[PDB]
Amino acid sequence: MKAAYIIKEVQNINSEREGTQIEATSLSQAKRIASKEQCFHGTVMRIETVNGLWLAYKEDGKRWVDCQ
Amino acid sequence: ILSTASVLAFERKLDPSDALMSAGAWAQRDASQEWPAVTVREKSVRGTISNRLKTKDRDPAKLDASIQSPNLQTVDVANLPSDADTLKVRFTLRVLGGAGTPSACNDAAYRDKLLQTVATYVNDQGFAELARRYAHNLANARFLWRNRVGAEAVEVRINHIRQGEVARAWRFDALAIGLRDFKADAELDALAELIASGLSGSGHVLLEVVAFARIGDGQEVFPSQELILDKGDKKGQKSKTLYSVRDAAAIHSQKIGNALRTIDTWYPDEDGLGPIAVEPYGSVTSQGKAYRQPKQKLDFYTLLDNWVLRDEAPAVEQQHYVIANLIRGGVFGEA
Amino acid sequence: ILSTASVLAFERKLDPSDALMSAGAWAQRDASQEWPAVTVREKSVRGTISNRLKTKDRDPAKLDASIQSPNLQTVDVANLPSDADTLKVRFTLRVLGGAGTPSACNDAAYRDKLLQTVATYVNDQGFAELARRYAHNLANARFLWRNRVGAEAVEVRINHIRQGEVARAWRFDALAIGLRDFKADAELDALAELIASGLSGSGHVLLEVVAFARIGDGQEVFPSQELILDKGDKKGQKSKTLYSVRDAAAIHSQKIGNALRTIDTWYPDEDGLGPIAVEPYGSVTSQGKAYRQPKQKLDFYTLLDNWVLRDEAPAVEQQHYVIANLIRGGVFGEA
Amino acid sequence: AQICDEALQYAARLRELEPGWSATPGCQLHDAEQLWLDPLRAQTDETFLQRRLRGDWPAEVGNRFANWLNRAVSSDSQILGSPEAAQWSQELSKELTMFKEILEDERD
């Protein structure tokens, strides 16, 4: 249940940084942690596994687009 | 009440180009038009492991097992030819002017107040400090990033280009003009008045900037570095790729622009480090530190909202920094 | 508390160039500027199977079935011309200086402690032992890796090149100087003082290192080896690809840089094995072993972490090794 | 086992479906394979490549296929250091021997 997730907050939908690692129960919990840990205004969150597979992203002002 | 605008976008004044690098022999820098370009080619390296192990890989047998199977890479390398000792980095710089007018703004009243504030700054003290510091960054070859640090003799040639040819040409010694002091000169103030006329909008300026570097016969020059796709193996890894426009190594335009913006000596921490680049929350990423933190009232955004909305004009150094940020460009405004 | 920094990145001092190899006859070594280069060409080989058999393919019929079908390759080979008995390997070496200052570092206090540490090192003793050993590895042609082992007579000419020409010329006998003993000499002391004036930051040093080797008429020279893409059939397999810059064989520059760094005599194993190349976890990849394992407290990382953080200065040989590692460069720092 | 069965069936339908292995030559086809072109090199060329396939017995493809399989294991130091690497290499060698001996008898 305590699955590890990677949270990147990047400039547009296709930009890569390193993102911090959390440990959450569910993906709906990681969507709620990542929306709290958004430093800047015009950035785009994204949730990853530890290998690089995507889970979800969210532009600012819109809602969570969910691919895998 | 004059709230700030939701959108703001300032276009980029001081547009540089991609800096093409070519190679040739010193003492014929005046014939440096047919100089052949520095070609990016490939070479393959081996590596023993030299990183800090995480105490679990500190077994002797695991370490010997790691150093028995080394990583094979291919890297891009760029070198001068074996009969030339001068690197010629050549780019053009166009200064536009109209530094206050945004390219997007919702609130009209904020736009009038911001244009009024910028016109007040231009009337009180024109682009004279900023053009002096941009002329210093054009004078010393700071845009030569790592091709400068071991150079014997660097010479920068700046030509102001009118309708089809040069109108006024300069020639500097980039090693006498240090990387950390903004002194005065007789040619530097001429270049500063030219860039001042450019940024004010009272003239068209197109400077062709050439910089020669005495590095040595066939050493390693350092063009700008692209990023990698990394979909292949770890033996044909291609771990480092270099930028090149057409069979010719080059530095990115935004790296030249980051070098030209290194004018900020007004950050509240130690000035024994020297000038940094004008960024909001003025930060250097090689040193990983954020000067002008928002805890102190000295970042870009609090200075802008205090100067524009509630009319708290800061000192002339901080408004020099803010107008350098508006010349830099960006997207500002909340959501 | 002063923990270690997250990132650290020291530039490579002692930059060499890609060692071009040309060829000619001995006793006209003084006119060796228009010598034609050693070109990499191809030949085909036909090999029998020779490796060990893993106890299943030890059948006699399967063995004769394997030796009835040999492999075909097309190797790159580089030979001297049939009327030349001297290999000329030419490269330039540039000594930069400023060995203690990193390029990238997060912790300001770690940066100050490290700069203070290297300052106390250079104040208590200058780059005198290290420059002596670097001048030794320049003197004995160790950068000639396998072109040296069968040589009749090796001569190394080193020219300190000032503004356009040579300021101080050396000449050595590389067989008189052993590959394992650091003695004292007249010319080698002047060379060590020149490299000391380079590394200390007191001047511009650019040496042109030319090495002649009596190998014989038309023997095989050994340029560095490129890796192959492995794309085709096993008859035109192209098993060996040799490095070449422009129709001229060459040794990689990192091989010359590894050869100049063989100064580490201070590793805890037996000194009869000779000096090794200065690396963290000092390891020769030919012998597959890792001297200065992290179990002993003699690798680079624990020595630096004790010297900087808790002020435990080692013996002068271990700090010689540490400053040679800082001159070597690298990316240091954990995740 | 299912992996090498699907590899063999893929080779079977690719080699017996169309003449596309002998459709157009070039410089790069990985022509050391010779398993995806079984009747493609014998039915038209009876003396040229048929002796180059009957005497060679082209079966070295299992090693490149094995190197293709070694990307499927996660290249971690922990699974490399434990005995799972030895057990894994053991079962790959067994099923690779099976793939080799079935690839071998193609000339009959």
UniProtKB/Swiss-Prot annotation, chain D:
Null allele phenotype: Mutants lose phage DMS3 infection-dependent inhibition of biofilm formation while there is normal biofilm formation in the absence of phage infection. Decreased production of crRNA in the presence or absence of phage. Disruption of the entire Y.pestis-subtype CRISPR region disrupts crRNA production but does not alter phage resistance (possibly OLNs PA14_33350 to PA14_33310, and the flanking CRISPR loci), indicating this CRISPR is not involved in phage resistance.
Domain of life from the UniProt record: Bacteria
Family: Belongs to the CRISPR-associated Csy1 family.
Described function: CRISPR (clustered regularly interspaced short palindromic repeat) is an adaptive immune system that provides protection against mobile genetic elements (viruses, transposable elements and conjugative plasmids). CRISPR clusters contain sequences complementary to antecedent mobile elements and target invading nucleic acids. CRISPR clusters are transcribed and processed into CRISPR RNA (crRNA). Cas3 and Cascade participate in CRISPR interference, the third stage of CRISPR immunity (Potential). Involved in crRNA production or stability.
Note: In this bacteria, Y.pestis-subtype CRISPRs do not confer resistance to phage DMS3 or MP22, but instead are required for DMS3 infection-dependent inhibition of biofilm formation and possibly motility.
Quaternary data: Interacts directly with Csy2; part of the Csy ribonucleoprotein complex with a probable stoichiometry of Csy1(1),Csy2(1),Csy3(6),Cas6/Csy4(1)-crRNA(1). A Csy3(6),Cas6/Csy4(1)-crRNA(1) subcomplex is also formed.
Protein name as catalogued: CRISPR-associated protein Csy1
Lineage of source species: Bacteria, Pseudomonadati, Pseudomonadota, Gammaproteobacteria, Pseudomonadales
Included stretch of the parent chain: 327 to 434 of 434
